[PDB]
Amino acid sequence: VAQISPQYPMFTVPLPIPPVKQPRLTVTNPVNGQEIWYYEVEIKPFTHQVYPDLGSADLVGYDGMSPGPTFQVPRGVETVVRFINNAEAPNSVHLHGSFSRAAFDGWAEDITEPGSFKDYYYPNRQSARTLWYHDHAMHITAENAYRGQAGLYMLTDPAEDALNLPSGYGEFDIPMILTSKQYTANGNLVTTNGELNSFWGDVIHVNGQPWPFKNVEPRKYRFRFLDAAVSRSFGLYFADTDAIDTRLPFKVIASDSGLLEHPADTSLLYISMAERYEVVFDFSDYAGKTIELRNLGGSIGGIGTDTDYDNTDKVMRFVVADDTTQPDTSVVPANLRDVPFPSPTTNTPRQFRFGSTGPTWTINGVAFADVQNRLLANVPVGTVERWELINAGNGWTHPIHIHLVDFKVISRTSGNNARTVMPYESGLKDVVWLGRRETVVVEAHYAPFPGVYMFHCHNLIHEDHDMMAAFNATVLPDYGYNATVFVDPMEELWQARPYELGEFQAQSGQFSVQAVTERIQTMAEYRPYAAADE
Ligand SMILES: *[C@@H]1O[C@H](CO)[C@@H](O[C@@H]2O[C@H](CO)[C@@H](O[C@@H]3O[C@H](CO)[C@@H](O)[C@H](O)[C@@H]3O)[C@H](O)[C@H]2NC(C)=O)[C@H](O)[C@H]1NC(C)=O
Ligand SMILES: *[C@@H]1O[C@H](CO)[C@@H](O[C@@H]2O[C@H](CO)[C@@H](O)[C@H](O)[C@H]2NC(C)=O)[C@H](O)[C@H]1NC(C)=O
Ligand SMILES: [Cl-]
Ligand SMILES: [Cl-]
Ligand SMILES: [Cl-]
Ligand SMILES: [Cl-]
Ligand SMILES: [Cl-]
Ligand SMILES: [Cu+2]
Ligand SMILES: [Cu+2]
Ligand SMILES: [Cu+2]
Ligand SMILES: [Cu+2]
Q1: Residue 336 Cα, ligand 6 centroid: separation in angstroms?
Q2: Is residue 308 part of a domain?
Q3: Which of 449, 472, 479 best tests ligand 1's pocket when mutated (most atoms within 8 Å of CB)?
Q4: Do 177 and 314 sit in the same domain of this protein?
């Protein structure tokens, strides 16, 4: 259908690369003698000239940019991030892909008001994976994410580095953060406010830039795909501009939770809101060509319900040089890793229906705001459960996310007989797309931390009104590990605190090296992540 946003000069602006976020300082953890990396992020307003010849867009971003800066954290290094709200609305930061404690996980009611900050303590102990950090504030997650509160968080480890995959952040390892937005006639953003169905968007962005291009050499690149859109799901494929409908093969090497056991040879990648897939594309057979990254129409080939617009079949262009300037020393091994799959269970699976209750998107008839009813499962820590995630509807799709866990996709049935489990769903994930009339069974180890966690649809419009619920990963009162201060996401110990911008700017008072060092060493003594040792 006709583009609504003004006409854009397609494939004329280079793909931006978010800068790497550096820690401000390190603090010795008195528990283990190891260095904790401490970071400060200021959430604040900024303008960005998206349309060359119109006005600017009003955004709110981590460190005044969108996407937020990229974190790059070695496995085993604990991080503390001071998220400082200097904006106009509350925030709640979630690190998507991290088994964070309940009070460091971005619980939707666990907000920071403007003129407050919160310190988030992250374990970084899971398998090498592409995480992302983004807003989770109750009822305003769609508008906070849409206006710029999302960024990448790469968890790295030597074992993955030894595979010799294409490497170097911004060299041959490229972030590909997809969004779908809409602009006014003067080049400002159309708000998601008031939208209760889906905000599709008619402008496709990579790393915050409409329809970019990149100069590539004829060799192998690792692309880290993330669907950070409010509502748009994608069917990604690559094509030579000399044969724009001919799909070129590539390899998926990783899903949400890390490496697949083996690369999945693929010509079409379904990716829905909050899914991460890492792809290796070999440009060597296309020296001197232009390869367009494109998006499947027909509402992702009948899987989705998304509206299609004139230019939503276009993502970006890669202009391939005639030659490499340096040898391609990278490879994609046939064997990537032993995926740590959960033990099969015979426990009769729980059922969750993703539908509506009057004008509200619900789970088993319940809206997140409804405290009395929204706690839908008690799961003893250590237990493996199958959850049957049901989309009975033909008129909506729902990428379902479960906090804390990594899960295996056991099965998919389609009431449109459209598809079962995709080859790139063979490993571990934390989001799974319920297409039209789809039921998916996932299996997860509810481990290793007790606490109250969210699960929900990651269509941020659905999530906000109000397709989200909670589970309690439970322990018996003799469990230990300071569980009584780490189960409650709203625990007073970990709540946000007020700051004065002067102190922040001068790095004085509670921002002094001394105050930060004392505050982090005190936090570290509670031993939040001790139960994940081994
Ligand atoms: C989520 O599950 C956790 C358990 O993993 C629940 O917290 C547990 O709640 C029980 C009942 O309040 C606590 O026992 C109580 O202890 C106090 C004082 O020592 C006593 O006054 C009461 O008679 C009772 O025995 C238990 O300590 C607590 N466990 C932990 C580890 O905090 C929690 O309530 C559940 N959350 C929700 C929202 O349902
Ligand atoms: C639970 O948290 C408390 C409070 O941080 C920890 O108590 C500290 O432990 C170290 C070593 O035992 C002492 O030198 C500190 O003086 C303790 N502080 C206080 C205020 O008691 C405790 O270690 C933690 N327990 C577990 C199992 O994690
Ligand atoms: Cl490389
Ligand atoms: Cl919808
Ligand atoms: Cl953006
Ligand atoms: Cl080479
Ligand atoms: Cl202050
Ligand atoms: Cu998320
Ligand atoms: Cu999450
Ligand atoms: Cu949904
Ligand atoms: Cu969430």
Answers
A1: 22
A2: yes
A3: 472
A4: yes
